[PDB]
Tab-separated table of C-alpha atoms in Angstrom:
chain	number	residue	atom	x	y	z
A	6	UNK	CA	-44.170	-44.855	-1.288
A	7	UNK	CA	-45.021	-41.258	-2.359
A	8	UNK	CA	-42.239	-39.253	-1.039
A	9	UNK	CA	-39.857	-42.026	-2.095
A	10	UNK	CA	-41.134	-41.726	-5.902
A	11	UNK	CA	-40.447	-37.905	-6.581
A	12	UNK	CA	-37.168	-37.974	-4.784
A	13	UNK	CA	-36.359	-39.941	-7.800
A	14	UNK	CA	-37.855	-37.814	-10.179
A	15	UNK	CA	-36.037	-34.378	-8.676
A	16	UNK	CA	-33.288	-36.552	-8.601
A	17	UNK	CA	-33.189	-37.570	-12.379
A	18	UNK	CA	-33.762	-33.723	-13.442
A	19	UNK	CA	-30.403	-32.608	-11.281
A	20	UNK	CA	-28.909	-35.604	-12.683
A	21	UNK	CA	-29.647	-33.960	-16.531
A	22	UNK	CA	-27.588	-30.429	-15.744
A	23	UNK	CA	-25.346	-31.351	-13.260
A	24	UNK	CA	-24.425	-33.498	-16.472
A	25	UNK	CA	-24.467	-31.219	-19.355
A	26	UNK	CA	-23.028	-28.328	-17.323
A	27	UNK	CA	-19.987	-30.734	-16.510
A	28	UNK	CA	-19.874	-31.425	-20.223
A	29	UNK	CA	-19.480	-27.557	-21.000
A	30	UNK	CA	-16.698	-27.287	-18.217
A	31	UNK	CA	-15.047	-30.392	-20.747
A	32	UNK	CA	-15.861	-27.641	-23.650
A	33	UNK	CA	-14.023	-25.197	-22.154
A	34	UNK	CA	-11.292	-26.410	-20.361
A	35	UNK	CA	-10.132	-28.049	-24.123
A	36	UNK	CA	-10.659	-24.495	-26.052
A	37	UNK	CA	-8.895	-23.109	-23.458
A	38	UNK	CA	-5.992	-25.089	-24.218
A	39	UNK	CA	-6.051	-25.620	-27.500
A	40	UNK	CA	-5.914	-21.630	-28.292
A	41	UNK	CA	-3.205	-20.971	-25.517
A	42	UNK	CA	-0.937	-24.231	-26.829
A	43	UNK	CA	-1.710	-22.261	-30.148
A	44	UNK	CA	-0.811	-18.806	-29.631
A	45	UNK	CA	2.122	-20.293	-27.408
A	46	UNK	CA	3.692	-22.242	-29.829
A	47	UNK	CA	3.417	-18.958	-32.698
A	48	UNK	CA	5.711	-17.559	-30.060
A	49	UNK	CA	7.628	-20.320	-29.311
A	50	UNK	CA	8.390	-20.924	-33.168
A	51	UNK	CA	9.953	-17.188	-33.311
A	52	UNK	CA	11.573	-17.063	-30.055
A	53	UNK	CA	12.920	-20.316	-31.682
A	54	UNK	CA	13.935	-18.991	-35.093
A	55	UNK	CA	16.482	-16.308	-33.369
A	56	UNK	CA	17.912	-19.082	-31.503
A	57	UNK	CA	18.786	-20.913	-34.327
A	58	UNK	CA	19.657	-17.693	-36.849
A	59	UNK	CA	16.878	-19.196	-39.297
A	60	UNK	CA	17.840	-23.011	-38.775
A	61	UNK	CA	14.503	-24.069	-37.851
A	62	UNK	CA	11.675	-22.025	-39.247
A	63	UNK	CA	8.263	-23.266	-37.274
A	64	UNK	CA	8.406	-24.933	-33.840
A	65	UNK	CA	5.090	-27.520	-33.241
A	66	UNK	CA	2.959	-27.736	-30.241
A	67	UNK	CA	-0.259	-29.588	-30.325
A	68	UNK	CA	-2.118	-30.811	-27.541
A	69	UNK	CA	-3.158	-34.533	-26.958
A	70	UNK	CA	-5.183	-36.370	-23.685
A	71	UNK	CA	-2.931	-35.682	-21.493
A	72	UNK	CA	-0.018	-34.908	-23.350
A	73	UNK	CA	1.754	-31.832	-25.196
A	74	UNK	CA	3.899	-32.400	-28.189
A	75	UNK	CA	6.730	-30.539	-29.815
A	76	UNK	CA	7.830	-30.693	-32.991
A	77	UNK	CA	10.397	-28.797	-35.211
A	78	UNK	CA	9.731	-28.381	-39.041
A	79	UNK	CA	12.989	-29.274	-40.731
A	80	UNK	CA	13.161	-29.743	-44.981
A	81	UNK	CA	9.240	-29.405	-44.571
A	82	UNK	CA	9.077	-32.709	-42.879
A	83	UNK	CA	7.516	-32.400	-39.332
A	84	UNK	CA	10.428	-34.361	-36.817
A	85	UNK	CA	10.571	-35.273	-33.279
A	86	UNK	CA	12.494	-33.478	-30.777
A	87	UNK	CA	15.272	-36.181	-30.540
A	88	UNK	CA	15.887	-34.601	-33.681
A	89	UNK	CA	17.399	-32.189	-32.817
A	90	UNK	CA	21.555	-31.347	-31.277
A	91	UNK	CA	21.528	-31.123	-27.722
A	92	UNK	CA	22.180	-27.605	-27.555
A	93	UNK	CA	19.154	-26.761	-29.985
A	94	UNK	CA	17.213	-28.924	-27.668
A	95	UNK	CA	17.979	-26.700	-24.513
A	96	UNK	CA	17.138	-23.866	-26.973
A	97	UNK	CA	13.760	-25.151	-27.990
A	98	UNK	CA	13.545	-25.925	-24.488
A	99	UNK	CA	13.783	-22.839	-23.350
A	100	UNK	CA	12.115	-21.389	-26.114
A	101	UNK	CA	9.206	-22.690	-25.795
A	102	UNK	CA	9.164	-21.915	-21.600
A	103	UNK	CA	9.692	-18.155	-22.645
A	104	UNK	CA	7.323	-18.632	-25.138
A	105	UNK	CA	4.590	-19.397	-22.444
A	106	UNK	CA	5.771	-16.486	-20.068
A	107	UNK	CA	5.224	-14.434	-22.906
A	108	UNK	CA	1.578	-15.734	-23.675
A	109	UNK	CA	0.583	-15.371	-19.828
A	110	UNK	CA	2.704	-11.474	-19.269
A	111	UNK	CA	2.417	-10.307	-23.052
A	112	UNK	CA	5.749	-8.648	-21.944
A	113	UNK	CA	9.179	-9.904	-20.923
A	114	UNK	CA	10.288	-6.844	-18.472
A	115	UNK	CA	11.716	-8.976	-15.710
A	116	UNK	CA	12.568	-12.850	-15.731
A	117	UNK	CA	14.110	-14.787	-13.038
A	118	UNK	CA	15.839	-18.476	-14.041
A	119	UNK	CA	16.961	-20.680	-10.960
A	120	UNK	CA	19.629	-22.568	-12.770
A	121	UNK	CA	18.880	-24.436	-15.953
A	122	UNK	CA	22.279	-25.387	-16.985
A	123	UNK	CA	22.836	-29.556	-15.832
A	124	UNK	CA	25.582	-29.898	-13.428
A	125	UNK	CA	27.943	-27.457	-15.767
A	126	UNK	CA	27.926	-29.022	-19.072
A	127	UNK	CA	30.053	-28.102	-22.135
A	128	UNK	CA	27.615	-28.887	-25.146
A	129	UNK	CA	24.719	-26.627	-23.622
A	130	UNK	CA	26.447	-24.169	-21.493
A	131	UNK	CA	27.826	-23.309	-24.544
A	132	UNK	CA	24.475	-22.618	-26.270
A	133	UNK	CA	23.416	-20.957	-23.318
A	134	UNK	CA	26.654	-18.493	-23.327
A	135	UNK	CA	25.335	-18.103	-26.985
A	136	UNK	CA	21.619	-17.381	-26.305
A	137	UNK	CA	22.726	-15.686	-23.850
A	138	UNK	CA	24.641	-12.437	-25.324
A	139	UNK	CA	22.773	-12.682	-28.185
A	140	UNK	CA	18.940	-12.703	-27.063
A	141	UNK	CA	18.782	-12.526	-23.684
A	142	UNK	CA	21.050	-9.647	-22.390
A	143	UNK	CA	18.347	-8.070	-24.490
A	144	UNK	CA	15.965	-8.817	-21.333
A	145	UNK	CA	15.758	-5.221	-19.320
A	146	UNK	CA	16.790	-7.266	-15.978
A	147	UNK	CA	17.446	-11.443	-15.666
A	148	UNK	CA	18.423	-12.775	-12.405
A	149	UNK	CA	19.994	-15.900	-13.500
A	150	UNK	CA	21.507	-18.368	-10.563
A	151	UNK	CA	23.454	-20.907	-11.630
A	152	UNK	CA	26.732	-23.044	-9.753
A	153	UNK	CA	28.415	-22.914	-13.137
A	154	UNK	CA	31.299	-20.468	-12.943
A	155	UNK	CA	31.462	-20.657	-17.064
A	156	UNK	CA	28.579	-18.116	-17.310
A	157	UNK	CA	30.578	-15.707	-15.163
A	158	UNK	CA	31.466	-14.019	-17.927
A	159	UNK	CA	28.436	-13.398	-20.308
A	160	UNK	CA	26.352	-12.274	-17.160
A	161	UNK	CA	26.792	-8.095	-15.887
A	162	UNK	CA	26.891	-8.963	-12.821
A	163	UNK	CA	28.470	-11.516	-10.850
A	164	UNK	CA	27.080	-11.548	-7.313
A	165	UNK	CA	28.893	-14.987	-5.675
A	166	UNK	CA	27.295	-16.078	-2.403
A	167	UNK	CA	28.936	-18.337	-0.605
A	168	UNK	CA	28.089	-20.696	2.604
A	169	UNK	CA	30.692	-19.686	5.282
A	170	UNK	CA	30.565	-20.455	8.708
A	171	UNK	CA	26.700	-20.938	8.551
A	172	UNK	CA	25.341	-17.509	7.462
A	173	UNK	CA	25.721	-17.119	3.922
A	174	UNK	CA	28.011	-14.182	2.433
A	175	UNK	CA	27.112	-11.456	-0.989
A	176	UNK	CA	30.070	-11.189	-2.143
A	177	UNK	CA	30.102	-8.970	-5.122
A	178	UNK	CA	32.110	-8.858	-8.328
A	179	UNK	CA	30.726	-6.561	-10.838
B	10	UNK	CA	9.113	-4.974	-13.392
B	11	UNK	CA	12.652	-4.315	-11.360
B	12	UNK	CA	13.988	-5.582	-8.598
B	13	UNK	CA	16.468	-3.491	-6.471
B	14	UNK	CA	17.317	-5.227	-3.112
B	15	UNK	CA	16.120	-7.971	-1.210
B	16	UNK	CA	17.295	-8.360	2.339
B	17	UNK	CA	16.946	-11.116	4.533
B	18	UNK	CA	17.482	-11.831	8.169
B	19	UNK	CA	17.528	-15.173	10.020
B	20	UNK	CA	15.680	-17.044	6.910
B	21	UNK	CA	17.281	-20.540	6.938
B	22	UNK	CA	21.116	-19.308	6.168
B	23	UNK	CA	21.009	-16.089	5.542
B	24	UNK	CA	21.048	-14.321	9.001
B	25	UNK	CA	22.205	-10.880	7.589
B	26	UNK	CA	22.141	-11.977	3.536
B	27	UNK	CA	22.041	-7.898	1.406
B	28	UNK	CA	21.732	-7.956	-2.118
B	29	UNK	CA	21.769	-4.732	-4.963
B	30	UNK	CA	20.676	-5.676	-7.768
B	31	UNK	CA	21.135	-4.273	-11.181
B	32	UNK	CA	19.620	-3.817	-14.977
B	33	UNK	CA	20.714	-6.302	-17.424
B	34	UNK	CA	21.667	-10.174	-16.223
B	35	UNK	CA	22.564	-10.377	-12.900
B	36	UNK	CA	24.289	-13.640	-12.381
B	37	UNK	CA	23.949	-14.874	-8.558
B	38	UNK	CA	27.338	-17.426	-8.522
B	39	UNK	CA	27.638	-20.042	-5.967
B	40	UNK	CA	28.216	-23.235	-4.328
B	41	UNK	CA	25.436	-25.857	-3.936
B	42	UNK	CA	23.222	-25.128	-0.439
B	43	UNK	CA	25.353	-21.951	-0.275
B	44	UNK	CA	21.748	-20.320	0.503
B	45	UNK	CA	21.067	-18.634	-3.245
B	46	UNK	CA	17.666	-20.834	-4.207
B	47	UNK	CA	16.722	-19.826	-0.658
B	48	UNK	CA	17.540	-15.826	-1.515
B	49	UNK	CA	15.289	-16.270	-4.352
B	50	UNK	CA	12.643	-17.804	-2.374
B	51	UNK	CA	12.769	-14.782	0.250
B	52	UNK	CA	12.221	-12.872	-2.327
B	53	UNK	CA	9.382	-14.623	-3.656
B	54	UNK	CA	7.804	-14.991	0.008
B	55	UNK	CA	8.670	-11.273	0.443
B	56	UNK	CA	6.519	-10.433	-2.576
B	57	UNK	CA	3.640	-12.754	-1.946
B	58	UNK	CA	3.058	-13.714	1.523
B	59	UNK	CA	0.888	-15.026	2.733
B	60	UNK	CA	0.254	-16.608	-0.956
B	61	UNK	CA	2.046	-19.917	-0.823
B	62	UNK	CA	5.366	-20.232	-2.668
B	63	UNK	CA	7.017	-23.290	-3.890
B	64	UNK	CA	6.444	-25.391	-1.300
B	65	UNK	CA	7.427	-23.398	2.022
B	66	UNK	CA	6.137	-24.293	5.466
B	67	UNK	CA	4.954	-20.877	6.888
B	68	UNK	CA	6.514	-21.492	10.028
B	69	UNK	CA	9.758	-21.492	7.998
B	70	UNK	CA	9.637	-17.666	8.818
B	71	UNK	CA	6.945	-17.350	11.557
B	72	UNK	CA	8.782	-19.692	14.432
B	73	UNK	CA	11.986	-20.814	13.669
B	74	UNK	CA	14.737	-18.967	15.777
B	75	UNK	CA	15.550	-16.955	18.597
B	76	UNK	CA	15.725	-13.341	17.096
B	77	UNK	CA	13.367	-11.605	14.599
B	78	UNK	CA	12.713	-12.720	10.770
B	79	UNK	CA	13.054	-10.260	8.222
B	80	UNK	CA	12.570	-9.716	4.566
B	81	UNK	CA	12.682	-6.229	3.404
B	82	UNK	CA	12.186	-5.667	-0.332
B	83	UNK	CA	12.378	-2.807	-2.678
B	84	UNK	CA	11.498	-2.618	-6.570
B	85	UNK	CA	10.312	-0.526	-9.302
B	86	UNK	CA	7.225	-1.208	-10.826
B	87	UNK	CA	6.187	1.389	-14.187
B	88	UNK	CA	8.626	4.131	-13.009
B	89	UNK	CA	7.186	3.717	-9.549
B	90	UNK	CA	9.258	2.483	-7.049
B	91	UNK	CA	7.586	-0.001	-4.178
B	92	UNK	CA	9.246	-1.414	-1.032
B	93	UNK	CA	7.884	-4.253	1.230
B	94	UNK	CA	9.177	-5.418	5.267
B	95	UNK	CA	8.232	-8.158	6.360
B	96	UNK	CA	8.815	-8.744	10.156
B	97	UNK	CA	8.417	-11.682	12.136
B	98	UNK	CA	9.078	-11.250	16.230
B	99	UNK	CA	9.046	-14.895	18.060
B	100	UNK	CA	8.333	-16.662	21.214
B	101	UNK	CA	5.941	-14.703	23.832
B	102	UNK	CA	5.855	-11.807	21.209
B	103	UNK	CA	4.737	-13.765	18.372
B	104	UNK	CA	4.053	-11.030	16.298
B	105	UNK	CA	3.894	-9.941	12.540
B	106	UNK	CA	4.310	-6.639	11.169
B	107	UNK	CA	3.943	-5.590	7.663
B	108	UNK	CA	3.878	-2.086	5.405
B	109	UNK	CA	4.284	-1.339	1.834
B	110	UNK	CA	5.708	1.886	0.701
B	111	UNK	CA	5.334	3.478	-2.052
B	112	UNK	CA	8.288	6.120	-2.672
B	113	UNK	CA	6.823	9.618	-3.209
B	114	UNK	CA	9.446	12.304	-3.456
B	115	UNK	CA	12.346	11.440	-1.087
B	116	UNK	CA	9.799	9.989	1.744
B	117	UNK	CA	8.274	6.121	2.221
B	118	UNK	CA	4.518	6.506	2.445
B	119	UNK	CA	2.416	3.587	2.769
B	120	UNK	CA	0.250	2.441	-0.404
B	121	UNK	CA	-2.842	0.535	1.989
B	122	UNK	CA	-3.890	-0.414	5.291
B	123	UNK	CA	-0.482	-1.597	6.882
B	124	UNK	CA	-1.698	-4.590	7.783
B	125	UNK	CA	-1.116	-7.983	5.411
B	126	UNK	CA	-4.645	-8.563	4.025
B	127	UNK	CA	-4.585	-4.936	2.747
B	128	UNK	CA	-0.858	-4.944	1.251
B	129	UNK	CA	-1.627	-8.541	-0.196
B	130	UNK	CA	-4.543	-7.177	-2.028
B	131	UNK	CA	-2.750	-3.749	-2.499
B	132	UNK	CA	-0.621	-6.427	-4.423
B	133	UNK	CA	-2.913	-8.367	-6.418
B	134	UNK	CA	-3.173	-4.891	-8.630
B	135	UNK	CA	0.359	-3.912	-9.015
B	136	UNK	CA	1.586	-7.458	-10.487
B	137	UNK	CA	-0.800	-10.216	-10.005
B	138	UNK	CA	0.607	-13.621	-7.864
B	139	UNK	CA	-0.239	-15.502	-10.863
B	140	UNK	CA	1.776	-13.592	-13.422
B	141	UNK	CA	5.202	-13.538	-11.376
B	142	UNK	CA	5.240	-16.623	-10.044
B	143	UNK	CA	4.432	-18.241	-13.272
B	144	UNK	CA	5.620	-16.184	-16.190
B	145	UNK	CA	8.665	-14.033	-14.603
B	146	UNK	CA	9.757	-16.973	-11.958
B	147	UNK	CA	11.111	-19.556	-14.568
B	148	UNK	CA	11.388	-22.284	-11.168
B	149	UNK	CA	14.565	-24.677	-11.484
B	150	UNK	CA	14.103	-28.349	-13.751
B	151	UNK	CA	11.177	-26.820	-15.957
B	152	UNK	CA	12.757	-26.542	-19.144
B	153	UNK	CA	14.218	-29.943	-18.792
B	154	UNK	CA	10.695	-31.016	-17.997
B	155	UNK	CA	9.716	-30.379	-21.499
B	156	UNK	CA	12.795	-31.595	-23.111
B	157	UNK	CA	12.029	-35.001	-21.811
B	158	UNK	CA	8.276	-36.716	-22.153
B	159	UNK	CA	5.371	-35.320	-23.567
B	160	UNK	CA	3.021	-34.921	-20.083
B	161	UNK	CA	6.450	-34.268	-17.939
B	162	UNK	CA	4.714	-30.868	-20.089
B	163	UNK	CA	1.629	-31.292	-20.013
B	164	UNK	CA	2.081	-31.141	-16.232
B	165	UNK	CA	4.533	-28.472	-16.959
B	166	UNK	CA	2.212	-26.662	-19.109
B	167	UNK	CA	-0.944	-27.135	-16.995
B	168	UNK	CA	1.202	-25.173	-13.832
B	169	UNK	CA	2.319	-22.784	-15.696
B	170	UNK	CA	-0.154	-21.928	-18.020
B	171	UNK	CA	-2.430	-22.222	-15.568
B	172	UNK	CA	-4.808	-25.019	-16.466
B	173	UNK	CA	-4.987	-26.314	-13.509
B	174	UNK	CA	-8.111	-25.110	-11.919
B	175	UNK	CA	-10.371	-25.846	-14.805
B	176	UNK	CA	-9.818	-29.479	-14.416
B	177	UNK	CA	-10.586	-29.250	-10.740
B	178	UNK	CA	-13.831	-27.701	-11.340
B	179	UNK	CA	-14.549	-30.449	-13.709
B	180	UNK	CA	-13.690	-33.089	-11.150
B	181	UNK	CA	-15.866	-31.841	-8.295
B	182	UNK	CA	-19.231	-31.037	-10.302
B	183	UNK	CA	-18.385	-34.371	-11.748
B	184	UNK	CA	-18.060	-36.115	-8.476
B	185	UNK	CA	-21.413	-34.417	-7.858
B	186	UNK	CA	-22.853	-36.382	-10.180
B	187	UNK	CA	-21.879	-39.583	-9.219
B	188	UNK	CA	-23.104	-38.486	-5.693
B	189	UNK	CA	-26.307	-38.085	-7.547
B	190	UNK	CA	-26.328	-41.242	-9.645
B	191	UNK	CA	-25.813	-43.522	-6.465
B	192	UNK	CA	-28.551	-41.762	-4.487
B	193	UNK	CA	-30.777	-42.448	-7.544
B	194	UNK	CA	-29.243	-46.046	-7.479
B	195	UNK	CA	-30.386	-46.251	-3.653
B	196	UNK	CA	-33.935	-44.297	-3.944
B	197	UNK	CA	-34.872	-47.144	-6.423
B	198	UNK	CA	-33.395	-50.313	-4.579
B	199	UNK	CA	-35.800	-49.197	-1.856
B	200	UNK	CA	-39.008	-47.991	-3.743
B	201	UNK	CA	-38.404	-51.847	-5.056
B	202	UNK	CA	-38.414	-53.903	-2.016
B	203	UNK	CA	-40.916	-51.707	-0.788
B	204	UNK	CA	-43.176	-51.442	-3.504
């Protein structure tokens, strides 16, 4: 069958770029990610290094199928995040998540954090208290919302809402 | 960027919610489902309606309740200072209403079309939904997602920095091939038992 034949043919061609243009979309996408994993972790690293006052000197991010992993350069020896105290995990942590925001704004005007803290912990809220006068307050405006009375006191303001009687209530503090 | 006061009316708990905020870190104390995440996600609807946020139903605002929803906004964006209202009448009204001011002087004028296409475009210039959402929004559980796993981040990572849509594109042209390969697969099964 004629018809039948070149169908085939016209079908093959397609076949060739819809295949090699798919393989430049695999080109991409990776470059992509390497370079912004790259860039993001040269941030991450600093944004790490005031964290720490010096502690840890280079934070790791490379970029795997998927899966991202982080390491922290201690005595030269690369080391896995387990590594690390739990309060300098929360601070890579969060280092690195700032890190990003950075990459994608360039800038770090305004930043809002719905509650990172776990259920008011002792061991990390303190590092948080910590990074938090000493880095953040920095910030020009952070609208941080946490159930955690303990940061009450490192924040400006203290604006406690409150369910009662259905509607919620502002009430304000500072 | 800088926000001033968000004000919401008859959004899940808040019925008359007012909040002033302020420069440095304002911390936003309370009890569990005492209606804060939702405050934040008023905001965040303010800001980007109809752009989807978190994951909100849009009825959330548009039918539930008897009286009108209301999200009025106002921030400061490079010394300018911008002010959204978003109102949402029910039942046989059914109606939306929206306007952006801009404040010039001591007067609100409007910055576009007062209608929500215009003012969501108007948007897309002044801070891009892709920029606050992801960059300024650090949403609840993501650093955690990172501290635990290595693709808890790379699905962490590929929100946030945005790698989503790539992959996407890759698995639709890709699909298109094997739409292609099969219809080869048939065109020769046939040429065979025919010729």
């Amino acid at each position: 069958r004629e018809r039948v034949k070149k169908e085939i043919k016209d079908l093959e061609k397609a076949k060739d770029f819809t295949e090699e243009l798919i393989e430049k979309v695999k080109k991409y996408k990776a470059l992509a990610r390497e370079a912004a994993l790259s860039k993001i972790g040269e941030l991450a690293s600093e944004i790490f290094a005031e964290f720490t006052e010096g502690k840890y000197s280079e934070v790791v991010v490379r970029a795997e199928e998927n899966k991202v992993r982080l390491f922290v350069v201690w005595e030269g020896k690369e080391r896995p995040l387990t590594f690390l105290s739990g309060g300098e995990r929360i601070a890579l942590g969060l280092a690195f998540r700032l890190a990003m925001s950075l990459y994608l704004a360039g800038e770090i005007s305004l930043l809002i954090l719905d509650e990172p803290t776990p259920y008011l912990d002792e061991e990390r809220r303190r590092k948080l208290i910590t990074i938090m006068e000493r880095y953040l307050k920095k910030i020009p405006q952070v609208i941080l919302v946490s159930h955690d009375e303990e940061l009450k006191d490192a924040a400006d303001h203290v604006i406690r809402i409150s369910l009662e009687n259905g509607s919620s209530k502002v009430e304000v503090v500072s | 960027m800088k926000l001033e006061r968000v004000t919401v009316k008859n959004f899940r708990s808040h019925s008359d919610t007012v909040v002033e905020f302020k420069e440095g870190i304002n911390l936003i104390i309370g009890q569990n489902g005492s209606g804060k995440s939702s405050l934040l996600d008023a905001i965040l609807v303010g800001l980007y309606w109809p752009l989807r946020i978190k994951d909100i139903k849009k009825d959330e605002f548009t039918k539930v309740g008897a009286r009108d929803t209301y999200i009025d906004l106002i921030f400061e964006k490079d010394g300018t200072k911008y002010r959204i209202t978003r109102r949402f009448l029910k039942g046989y009204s059914s109606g939306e209403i929206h306007a952006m001011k801009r404040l010039v002087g001591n007067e609100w004028k409007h910055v576009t079309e007062p209608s929500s296409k215009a003012i969501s475009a108007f948007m897309e210039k002044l801070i891009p939904y892709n920029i606050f959402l992801n960059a300024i929004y650090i949403r609840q559980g993501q650093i955690d997602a990172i501290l635990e796993s290595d693709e808890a981040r790379e699905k962490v990572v590929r929100e946030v920095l945005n790698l989503d849509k790539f992959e996407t594109a890759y698995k639709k042209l890709s699909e298109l091939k094997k739409t292609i390969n099969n219809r080869i697969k048939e065109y020769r099964d046939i040429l065979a038992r025919t010729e």
